[PDB]
Amino acid sequence: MDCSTNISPKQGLDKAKYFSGKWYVTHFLDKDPQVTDQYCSSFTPRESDGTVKEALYHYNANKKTSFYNIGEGKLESSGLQYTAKYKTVDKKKAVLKEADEKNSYTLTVLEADDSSALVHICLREGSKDLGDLYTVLTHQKDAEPSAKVKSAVTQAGLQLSQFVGTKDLGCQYDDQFTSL
C-alpha cells in the first residue's frame, strides 16, 4: 500500500505557526491495516532560511520501547512541505547511526494555527512506503485540537472518528529531549 500521490500542502500557511515549539501527536490515522503497534510521538521542528531540522521521538505503546531521530531537509518552494533524511540518535542527541540515504520522509502541512496542526507523513525505507500517516498535533499533551484543525481533517477526506487518540494509550514521553 503506497502513500497517496494526491497530497498537497495548504497555501498561505504561516510557517511560523508550524515551526514553533514542540508538537505532540494527539490523534493519528494510518491507512495500512496490517499494522498492530500503536505509537505516541512528539517532535520539535525548526526552520532557518529554507532548511528544516527537527528532533523526533517515538514511543511504541505495545512494545514499551522508544526511539529518537533527527531529521533534516529543505522546504519546497511551493508550500509548507519537506522531504527529510534522518539519523538515529540517543536521548542525549548523540548520533547512533548516520542517515541512510535510501530512506526519507515527506511531511506535508495541511493546517496550522497557534494551538494545533494537521500533517501528512509519507515514510519511505528504500523501495518500500509505510503508507499514509495523518497526525493531528497540539502543543499541549492531551489537549483538543482547534476547530480549524478539526475542519482540515474533514476537508482532507477523513473522519476524525477513525483516528487513534493517543491520550489513552499510556504514553511515556521524553519532554527533556523535545524542549528547545
Binding site for heme: what residues are annotated? 58
Beta bridge partners, 29, equal 134
> Residue 3 CB: number of other CB atoms within 10 A?
20
State the minimum distance, in angstroms, from the CB of residue 45 to ligand HEM.
7
CA-closest candidate to residue 40, choices 71, 70, 67: 67
Identify whether the C-beta of residue 145 lies closer than 8 Å to the C-beta of residue 26.
Answer: yes
**In a 3-state reduction of DSSP, which class is residue 152?**
helix
| Interface residue list for ligand HEM (CB under 6 A) | 25, 28, 30, 39-41, 43, 56, 58, 67, 69, 71, 86, 88, 105, 107, 121, 123, 125, 130, 133, 135
Residue closer to ligand HEM by CB (options 133, 152) is 133
Query: Is the Cβ of residue 106 or residue 146 nearer to ligand HEM in the bound state?
Result: 106
Q: What is the nearest approach in angstroms of ligand HEM to the Cβ of residue 164?
A: 8
Q: Kindly state the smallest distance separating residue 139's Cβ from ligand HEM, in Å.
A: 14
Residue entry with cell 528504500: 126
Cβ pair 11, 79 in contact under 8 A: yes
CB of 18 to ligand HEM, least distance (A): 11
**Closer by beta carbon to ligand HEM, 27 or else 146:** 27
Name the residue nearer to ligand HEM (CB basis): 98 or 114: 98
Candidates 114, 110, 155; CA nearest to 135 is: 110
